[PDB]
Design a protein around this ligand. Sequence first.
Ligand SMILES: [K+]
Ligand SMILES: [K+]
Ligand SMILES: [K+]
Ligand SMILES: [K+]
Ligand SMILES: [K+]
Ligand SMILES: [K+]
Ligand SMILES: [K+]
Ligand SMILES: [K+]
Ligand SMILES: [K+]
Ligand SMILES: [Mg+2]
Ligand SMILES: [Mg+2]
Ligand SMILES: [Mg+2]
Ligand SMILES: [Mg+2]
Ligand SMILES: [Mg+2]
Ligand SMILES: [Mg+2]
Ligand SMILES: [Mg+2]
Ligand SMILES: [Mg+2]
Ligand SMILES: [Mg+2]
Ligand SMILES: [Mg+2]
Ligand SMILES: [Mg+2]
Ligand SMILES: [Mg+2]
Ligand SMILES: [Mg+2]
Ligand SMILES: [Mg+2]
Ligand SMILES: [Mg+2]
Ligand SMILES: [Mg+2]
Lengths: 146, 140, 186, 260
Amino acid sequence: AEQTEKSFLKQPKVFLSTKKADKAKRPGKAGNRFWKSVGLGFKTPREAIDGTYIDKKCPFTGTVAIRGRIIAGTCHSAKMNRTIIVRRNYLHFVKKYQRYEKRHSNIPAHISPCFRVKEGDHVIIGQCRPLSKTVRFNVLKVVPAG
Amino acid sequence: GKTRGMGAGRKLKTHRRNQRWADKAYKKSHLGNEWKKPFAGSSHAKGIVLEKIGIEAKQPNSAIRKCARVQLVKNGKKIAAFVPNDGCLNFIEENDEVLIAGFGRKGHAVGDIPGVRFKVVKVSGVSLLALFKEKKEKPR
Amino acid sequence: GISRDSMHKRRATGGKQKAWRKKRKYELGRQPANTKLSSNKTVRRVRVRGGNVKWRALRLDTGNFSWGSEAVTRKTRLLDVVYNSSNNELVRTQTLVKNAIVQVDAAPFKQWYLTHYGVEIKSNNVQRKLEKRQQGRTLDSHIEEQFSGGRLLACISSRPGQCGRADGYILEGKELEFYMRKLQKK
Amino acid sequence: ARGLKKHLKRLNAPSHWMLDKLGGAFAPKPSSGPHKARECLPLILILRNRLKYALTYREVQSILMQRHIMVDGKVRTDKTYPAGFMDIISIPKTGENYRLLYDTKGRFRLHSVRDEDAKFKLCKVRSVQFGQKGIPYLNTYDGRTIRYPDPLIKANDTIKLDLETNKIVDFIKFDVGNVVMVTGGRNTGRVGVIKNREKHKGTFETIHVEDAQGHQFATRLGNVFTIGKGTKPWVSLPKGKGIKLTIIEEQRKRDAAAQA
RNA sequence: AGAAGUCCAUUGAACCUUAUCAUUUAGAGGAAGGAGAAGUCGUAACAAGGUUUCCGUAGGUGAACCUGCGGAAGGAUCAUUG
RNA sequence: CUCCGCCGGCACCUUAUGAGAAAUCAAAGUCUUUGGGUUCCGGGGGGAGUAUGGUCGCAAGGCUGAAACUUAAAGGAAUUGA
RNA sequence: CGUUACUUUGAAGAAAUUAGAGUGCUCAAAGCAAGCCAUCGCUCUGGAUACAUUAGCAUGGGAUAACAUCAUAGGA
RNA sequence: UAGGAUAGGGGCCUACCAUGGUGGUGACGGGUGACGGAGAAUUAGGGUUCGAUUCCGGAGAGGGAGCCUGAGAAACGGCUAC
RNA sequence: GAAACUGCGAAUGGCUCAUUAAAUCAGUUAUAGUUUGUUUGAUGGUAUACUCGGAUAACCGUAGUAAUUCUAGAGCU
Ligand SMILES: [K+]
Ligand SMILES: [K+]
Ligand SMILES: [K+]
Ligand SMILES: [K+]
Ligand SMILES: [K+]
Ligand SMILES: [K+]
Ligand SMILES: [K+]
Ligand SMILES: [K+]
Ligand SMILES: [K+]
Ligand SMILES: [Mg+2]
Ligand SMILES: [Mg+2]
Ligand SMILES: [Mg+2]
Ligand SMILES: [Mg+2]
Ligand SMILES: [Mg+2]
Ligand SMILES: [Mg+2]
Ligand SMILES: [Mg+2]
Ligand SMILES: [Mg+2]
Ligand SMILES: [Mg+2]
Ligand SMILES: [Mg+2]
Ligand SMILES: [Mg+2]
Ligand SMILES: [Mg+2]
Ligand SMILES: [Mg+2]
Ligand SMILES: [Mg+2]
Ligand SMILES: [Mg+2]
Ligand SMILES: [Mg+2]
């Protein structure tokens, strides 16, 4: 079902054709789906542990690590393959007038199939290595608007 | 009234930015037209005396101001430069190096002399003050 | 020369970026090895940053291949390139790249299987160990039907243009079924 | 730049060196070595600016090329050798030994030590992990690698190293209640006991230290160096005893000294 | 082992071509504005300025201006329960 | 019809304890004892609502809108005189 | 197992420049020296401290304010 | 997505695929007599203007481009070409 | 001990501000995304030996060219 590419898609360093298969072993062993806790107090979604998708850029089942900044925001666009635009809204202080002005930043973030998101949801992203030209963040937690 | 909200910093800054162009000094500084002036932003300029001329003063006064017509060397622009210090027109000759300066009002005409914002300060490398006071002589 | 800099790209907004510096050597790229499957082995020494060595294979005909379920690794000849997921140009040109699907000689694996299991696909100790291994022995009949032809489907897991070698694993299981469907659809 | 910098401009030199502004265009750029360039005291500075043995760059060269100076038991002839915190500087001709400690103002001070006390240094464990062959190994912040360390030793620990034998003779576990010296930041040279360790996931860890007189200060984990098990440091301390004084109390001391 | 040479690829200066942009920029002729002498024709605005002034729009006239329609007092009326 | 209230509206009269350059204004007051909210909009007088670009309109024109240059005042309210 | 602004405290925010402690370069602009009855030496001599928007990290506070909810609580 | 390349992440490049990405919270474009900062001048406070220059960072060696050596250079008091 | 071979350096420093307007740069992060001569510390076992081979510079002497740390050939080590 997940094999939608011109290539087979496998989790790196997981031997699927193992003969001594076992489910009591740790993830990635005996043909088990690999997954990890990203750390920083973030729970691993159960749909990543029980998923069948293959995403190398997934924070929980892929090869990327979360290190650096942790940024909150709102889903501003979700029209790309596994990538969403996160809009951050903040107040910029103007020194001379002692006032604030509203400013925004559009941060591209990779979203793994373990989350389904819609424009307007509150998301938490964590900094990772560069994944594309503009993406340096991975969605870590999605809070729906309602 | 004027905007006062804590969240109206952008409004205030943009309004000040737009209104600063009404001030004459600000717009003179930040328009870039001072680079099209004869001096092109420099305090002094050198030039060739083209011809000695006498231009009449304003209506209340009655005098011939006896300025000089100078072609600048840096850009080839012809200007009229006043020659102060009674008798100093005789130190001025055609095809003679002169150092011009501003007439003191920043391109605005000065006194009863119409259309003149430049004075001769140095001729042939010798200051006009020295020639007036006979402290130095004009080279031949 | 080939560069890897973000200078020449457009911005994410679409705006053009004016250059503020010439190309640095620390951001170079080099021309691809374009490793061909051929019995004229040529691997060239590439001097890289830090005075280190990169091995650039131009023509390769032999590789080190692992049969993961059997946990055995043998040196086998490369016979053909059959599937590439990025470009069939690399299939027709017989270009060896990482994740290409190739035909490899099955003779070393047949020999090892005969020696280790006693089964073709002289002592009490030897026969006892052979019967112990033969108990629970299970092949998957797809590897078997390609053993019949002497050619095993394999995936190149090494990068020939970087390490100068064409190494890989023998395809098994779901990956094997996927690539057999791809090759029959070809 | 197209490579490493070889020169240190005198203005850009570390401020704890107390180099003067008009002494020249340049400062001694510390050579690579056990301590970081920004946190060390080069040998030339110790010999000329501090101990006054030499008066010039060339005189420092003359002293060092005579093999008169040992750093932690070993002869050094490099003038820009980066001598650092807790290093033993011995001159086995005048029979004097110095431990590089910090005064409460953040500046390295050559502290005279006994001959027996110059036989060990205190090192801070940077990490413990498996090397080649699966052999456990320890590394410190002063550049030493020690193989087969005691398994009870963890990162951020303080080990006592015998310079003669080059082995860990004792170690201190980084725990609450151990006397420490701050080696970095604005509290450099301050000595107190750890009261609590506040940990925050993914960022630097904060240590809360209280000195003997009761003043409390906080600093990052990378700037804390354990110097004793409990309230008794394993080394001797400079005259300040790590107790920082406010400028008002410093003025009180100066007034009292002038009055006497 | 290997030079000259050679093949393909790549980076690519530079040259030519089309058009565009940014400049600098002559320019017959036309037509403004300002300043200075200051001549001429009148007297339009200031007094109810001798047709009260002005605003908008349209037409006309040597020129100031004139006139039509609607508007204002900044009017020469704060005022007719008479 | 008459009288007394309440709310809302067009206004009017008196008064300064206010404000203002004053005229005057019961808001044009509650401002150097300076901050209720918000929109538009001015920065000496001309050149100039002109040139140019853009846009709208069949057109007339509307909206947006300079600069060079020139000038020591222009202007407001009030007083006395003519 | 609701955020944020705001505020408080802490760590950082190079040096030089600035403010500022000490110090009689003869004064001063400076400099980072120096001082001690004179000392085969000493004062562990000194070579402080403050400031450092905004943004980032951490601590306490929740008045003011912003956003999100806010009778299937269908609560536990 | 899969490769190639690189010291290494990455449309950095290639093949295939999808239609995205930025924008009055000003994208894109234009101007700058624009290298950025530490800082400088003037400052009751707030502020205005400057910051080529000795400290830090960047960039260039007539203009482009390409390289060899080397740990480190797209080096120019190194080479190759226009 | 000249010369010369070998090794190392010449990527620092000095100069300038042309280009460059989220770009440089500043503060603040990250490398679990890498290289790093050198310094410091530690580490190094399964591949005629009482010690192998051929060159080459300096040197020497035949030169070429108008000429250049332009250059060819011969004899050594
Ligand atoms: K660099
Ligand atoms: K009339
Ligand atoms: K009238
Ligand atoms: K009423
Ligand atoms: K890469
Ligand atoms: K890709
Ligand atoms: K080298
Ligand atoms: K070198
Ligand atoms: K930065
Ligand atoms: Mg009239
Ligand atoms: Mg009339
Ligand atoms: Mg006010
Ligand atoms: Mg005006
Ligand atoms: Mg990739
Ligand atoms: Mg410039
Ligand atoms: Mg500068
Ligand atoms: Mg310039
Ligand atoms: Mg200079
Ligand atoms: Mg510089
Ligand atoms: Mg360069
Ligand atoms: Mg030049
Ligand atoms: Mg170059
Ligand atoms: Mg030169
Ligand atoms: Mg150079
Ligand atoms: Mg340099």
